[PDB]
Structure 1
Amino acid sequence: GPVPSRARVYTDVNTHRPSEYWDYESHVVEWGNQDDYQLVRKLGRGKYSEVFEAINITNNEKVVVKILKPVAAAKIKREIKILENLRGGPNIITLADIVKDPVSRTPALVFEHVNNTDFKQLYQTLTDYDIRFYMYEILKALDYCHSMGIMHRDVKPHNVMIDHEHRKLRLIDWGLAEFYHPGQEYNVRVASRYFKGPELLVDYQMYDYSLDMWSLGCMLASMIFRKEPFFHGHDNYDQLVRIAKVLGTEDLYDYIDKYNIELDPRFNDILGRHSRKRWERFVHSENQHLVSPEALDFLDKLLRYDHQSRLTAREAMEHPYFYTVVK
């Protein structure tokens, strides 16, 4: 069957720490007082929660309340444990409290509020310098959570809050996050379609932190090339074909051969034969201001089929693309 895989970094973090750290089912939730929070306006609703802007009436500060839907209410302890483990980490959203919502009768997570600049506004106006600056801030969050034995598994622009006025970034929505345990087979139905790593698309379950680095590369590619999303698949199968049209099919076959993966036979009639395209093919007069040889080299080192060959977050922080960013 498939050849096993393990991360090249932070493999022993969970075994080294006490069981109480990663054994989220044994965690006893410390409930706060729901009356401390007055809901102001509904910000959104997904398949897993309803999100509200609120006021913490004990200090009059703005907060965000995520009232979990019963479908999410099963794996609530995992999100809570991850948020508590990562609390205070660089660019990690702060979990301020956990309360029982009086209406839904489910847990409601209370987070610090971030005055998030419009996504269209950020996508359309971030300069070359700002992209480098914010990419470095995301890497601080990813290296922290990976160093803490956790993979986010849903890295995408909607999960990155940016308060552009205060040059403040937060990585949010830890609902899909998991503890990395070497040799564990994980569910491949994670991340959003356009950000799914090839490991997910070929059904390779023994993945790790490096899945987040692929998703980060997808964000960077869309941003520097002005191509939203970069890999625009119609479904999960066409998603791999879109990747193969850029990275080529030869390296895809080398990847599946290395891990002894057998592609779904439905790929035989859609994948075709494609060479790798040089990153400069995507440069044009409307994106040339965001592209540089350093940006292309950095992107090249993230967007690799082989999850073990991608830069780790800490290696990525060493890249020449960030030399211009003030530290």
Structure 2
Amino acid sequence: MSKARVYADVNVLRPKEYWDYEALTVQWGEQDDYEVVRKVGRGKYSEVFEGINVNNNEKCIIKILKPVKKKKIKREIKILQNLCGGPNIVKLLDIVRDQHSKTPSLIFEYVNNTDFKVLYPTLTDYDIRYYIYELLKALDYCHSQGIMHRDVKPHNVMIDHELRKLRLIDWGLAEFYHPGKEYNVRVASRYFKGPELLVDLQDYDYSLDMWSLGCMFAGMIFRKEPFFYGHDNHDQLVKIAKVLGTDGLNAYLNKYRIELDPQLEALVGRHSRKPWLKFMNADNQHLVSPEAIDFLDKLLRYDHQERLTALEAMTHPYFQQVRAAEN
């Protein structure tokens, strides 16, 4: 039996109007208020375009959704509404649908994002600390509002580098946290899935996002994208085990009484823990200080209960300069 160490009762104390997302009645806007300017992306969930509001001439992002169940879309909409105005939380501007096809589109604020594959390599030590701190504000906020993002990855972190503006987007996989609830482990992107998802521990919590953040962070400071490069869910756990070591995995499994599938146990084998500095090289030297390693080490723990919470992470000395500058 596992439960979050912080914000566990947020949804217990709030009324049904907050977490009963299926009760939501979607208020449709007008499709004609928005026009496509250029396609900027695509995914299994939607096609994304840079758009413009013909009324105010303001830029926006239009995501034309592929077939989705009523329950799922209501969940994304309710969460976006509940988190409105929070630090670095993307703003949902409107929700529209095509009459004949009933194809819905979500309208979001526009962020002039630069491909992370091109942006990250140019980030300085300070830039990394700054952007990760900004992302942490968003995570502590949603966690404080009883919501788990469950899909933290570079693709869901829009950054306008010129303006130094960051937004955590795509809340379609997010969920409300309820103590003891068993969630679907089929969330997050493989390279960012926490050990809990990989060993089928269903009663996970906000801490899942912290493992994903840790993966992003490790990728940035070590200049290795992605950090844990597995080809399937089983191999993903193997990649993690070859770094953190099987001793910690065994302890983790014993604590929560989890039994790995025979095939998985075989693939994992036995591995010694590898010091974080073994990933240091001439290319990532100006970015792997002791503070960075200490911070990373406290994020990437098998036991989700051991990981730093977003609030704790924000106070780690690694971010002391960012905090000082802000104050």
Q: TM-score, normalised by structure 2?
A: 0.97
Match of 2:78 in 1: 81
What is the distance in 2 between the residues matched to 1:79 and 1:125? 33
Match of 1:19 in 2: 16
Match of 1:148 in 2: 145
Match of 2:187 in 1: 190
Match of 1:123 in 2: 120
Instruction: Report matched runs for 1:242-281 at 5 Å.
Output: 242-281=239-278
1:227 pairs with 2:230: no
1:165 pairs with 2:162: yes
What is the distance in 1 between the residues matched to 2:128 and 2:159? 12
What is the alpha-carbon root mean square deviation over aligned residues? 1.1
**Structure 2: which amino acid aligns with 1:243?**
I
How far the C-alpha of 1:212 sits from its partner, in A, is 0.2
Query: What's the secondary structure of 2:266's corresponding residue?
Result: coil
How far the C-alpha of 1:312 sits from its partner, in A, is 0.2
Query: What's the secondary structure of 1:324's corresponding residue?
Result: helix
How far the C-alpha of 1:9 sits from its partner, in A, is 0.4
8 A Cα contact 1:67 1:101, kept in partner: no
How far the C-alpha of 1:269 sits from its partner, in A, is 2.2
Match of 2:56 in 1: 59
**Unpaired runs of at least 5, structure 1:** none
How far the C-alpha of 1:31 sits from its partner, in A, is 1.5
8 A Cα contact 1:48 1:72, kept in partner: no
How far the C-alpha of 1:157 sits from its partner, in A, is 0.2
Provide Cα deviations, 1:201-228, integer angstroms capped at 9, x if missing partner: 0011000000000000000111101111
- Percent sequence identity is 76
8 A Cα contact 1:152 1:176, kept in partner: yes
Provide Cα deviations, 1:143-199, integer angstroms capped at 9, x if missing partner: 000000000000000100000111100000001000001111000010001000000
Query: What's the secondary structure of 1:297's corresponding residue?
Result: helix
What is the distance in 1 between the residues matched to 2:235 and 2:69? 29
8 A Cα contact 1:92 1:172, kept in partner: yes
Match of 1:28 in 2: 25
How far the C-alpha of 1:102 sits from its partner, in A, is 4.3
What is the distance in 2 between the residues matched to 1:231 and 1:103? 44
How far the C-alpha of 1:240 sits from its partner, in A, is 0.5
Match of 2:290 in 1: 293
What is the distance in 1 between the residues matched to 2:46 and 2:267? 36
8 A Cα contact 2:22 2:71, kept in partner: no
Deviates more, 1:96-105 or 1:223-232: 96-105
Match of 1:42 in 2: 39
What is the distance in 1 between the residues matched to 2:128 and 2:199? 31
8 A Cα contact 1:237 1:267, kept in partner: yes
Q: TM-score, normalised by structure 1?
A: 0.97
How far the C-alpha of 1:262 sits from its partner, in A, is 0.7
8 A Cα contact 2:3 2:203, kept in partner: yes
Match of 2:208 in 1: 211
How far the C-alpha of 1:44 sits from its partner, in A, is 2.3
8 A Cα contact 1:34 1:101, kept in partner: yes
**Unpaired runs of at least 5, structure 2:** none
Q: How many residues align?
A: 324
How far the C-alpha of 1:73 sits from its partner, in A, is 5.1
